[PDB]
Structure 1
């Protein structure tokens, strides 16, 4: 997260870190045994880390669980990033508490202008790379599809939404991928891609979660 602030400890209880010996992506806990992330974060073996604040220091609230089933959206297009959503079933249910809790699926698509919270342990620099120890937070609004499509050098599909600032300075970045965009208590987006990080006229692009609620529930029930 570029231009954000350090989240208060365990104030984003649904946030998880996907680890394969190192943190490589984020995710959201949607129920005691299922996590939603980005398909581009796929790996054959993933350890999900919950209750984290400092990913490099054991604090006493962590629960590390291995992924049992890693399910990418059947239509994930690796070239356009369309359908960039993935579900991870944990090998065992987690203990839900104050620092480890679930986030609700959207009831409807949030309107442009809605203020949301983006979080992650991704790169904090607009140029170069710097991985933070502590979870970062960013308050950012959903942008009108017109500004989204216009700013993007690539095709923005109906399954994508821009969140951020046209002026730059604040944005998600590498390592935040798969992470949550929560607006009014509901998961509205998933960190997907962007041209650079925190660049003017280049807001980040996220998977529009409200378009997959049915697929999410169907997959969970069938697995």
Structure 2
């Protein structure tokens, strides 16, 4: 995250961190239930063998409530390709269930129509992660969060060199130099509705980070709810 704020105690409990063999975070994830993590399909190319870290806010300090979970099943969307970045979604089934506690809790999955008419129409959402704090930088050791305005679909397409599909959405600032970055990929984009946080997006990509006239591109969670629901039955 470029700019923004640190996630304080219990603020971003649905954040999951994908860690490679070297125990270094490379992508985010969203906790959906005790056995399921939502992430980006393109994250599955960043490492051969990976684990899921939950309850982590600071990668330097071995916390309390912090736990490592091995992946049993990787459920990748067969329509994903690096040429388009379309269908940038995956679901992970863990070997062992997550223990919910302070800093460990799932985000809600909304119903499609309500998410589109009510959540997507709010002014802002919140993106979080352990990604780069500057376009040129190292992975953050601290979990950050950033309130991001929803961007009008027309402005979103005009802003981009690449094709913005119906499975994607824009969020961010045109001038303010704060946004998600590399390493935030797969992480949560949540929208608050009456003190309840619903998962609305998956950090997918962007042209650099926090660039003026550019935005964060997210996988639209509403477009894959049945596919997500189905994945959790297996």
Q: Same fold (TM over 0.5)?
A: yes
Aligned residues: 221
- Partner residue of 2:10? 10
Aligned pairs for 1:1-223 (under 5 A) are 1-20=1-20, 21=22, 22-42=24-44, 43-107=47-111, 108-109=115-116, 110-126=119-135, 128-184=136-192, 185-221=197-233, 223=234
1:68 Cα deviation after fit:
0.8
Contact conserved, 1:168 with 1:201, CA < 8 A, in 2? Answer: no
Normalised to the residue count of structure 1, the TM-score between the two structures is 0.95
Moved more, 112-121 or 140-149: 112-121
- 3-state SS of 2:65 partner: coil
Distance 1:91 1:151 in 2: 41
- 3-state SS of 1:205 partner: strand
Gapped runs of 5+ residues in structure 2?
A: none
Contact conserved, 1:45 with 1:67, CA < 8 A, in 2? Answer: no
Distance 1:186 1:113 in 2: 12
> RMSD in angstroms over aligned alpha carbons?
1.2
1:167 Cα deviation after fit:
1.3
1:168 Cα deviation after fit:
4.1
Gapped runs of 5+ residues in structure 1?
A: none
- 3-state SS of 1:88 partner: strand
